[PDB]
Amino acid sequence: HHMATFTTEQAGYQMQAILQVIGYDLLIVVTGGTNPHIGDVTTLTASTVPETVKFPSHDGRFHKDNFISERMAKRIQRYLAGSCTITAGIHVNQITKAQIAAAAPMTDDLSRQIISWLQAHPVQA
């Protein structure tokens, strides 16, 4: 009804998106790899430019999981009934080159599943 879970696995590691509908608004939690976390949080509505918070990681640098959160936002923006919040934290120990390139097709694959679920479950009752 108001909660769904989507997974995908390419190049030997998994990514998961957990979606929650609250009122007309959406919360999506994206994780994967060996160490799930919350690295970045992207915020948007259907007719608003997305904003992203990047949390600090180590050595003065910031988490780069916003590649995932910002791409999923662009893919699903047109379908938003209200606000949308996307958290992302994907990390694979000793990640490989083929694994890095698979991050974008995996985000698209989850985005497509989310979009299908939204069309089958109109947030308007």
Next chain:
Amino acid sequence: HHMATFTTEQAGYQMQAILQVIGYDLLIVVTGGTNPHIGDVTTLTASTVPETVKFPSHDGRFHKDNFISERMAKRIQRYLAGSCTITAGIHVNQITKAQIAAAAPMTDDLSRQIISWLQAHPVQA
């Protein structure tokens, strides 16, 4: 283990906080009243100033649920092992004056429950 739910009810309406631990990081979803939603999203760590996104509501104005999200952030900041994300959407149809004043004691009551749970479940294994 990694998920807990806290409720409180004062002046005849309820507020709920759902907490999720991901890695070392926290996601807290606060709702209540007749129409739960996601109005505002506050982001912080233990030694960082909090930032808040205010989503648009109606008539060019913005949701004011950040009163709740920003107060819960201040209450629990010292206890944070990593990043923290707090969403808030509380709305009561024809809210009353006693109900408005109860918003702050209710947020404190949830914050105290969250803090107790974090101390009993150290995010470090």
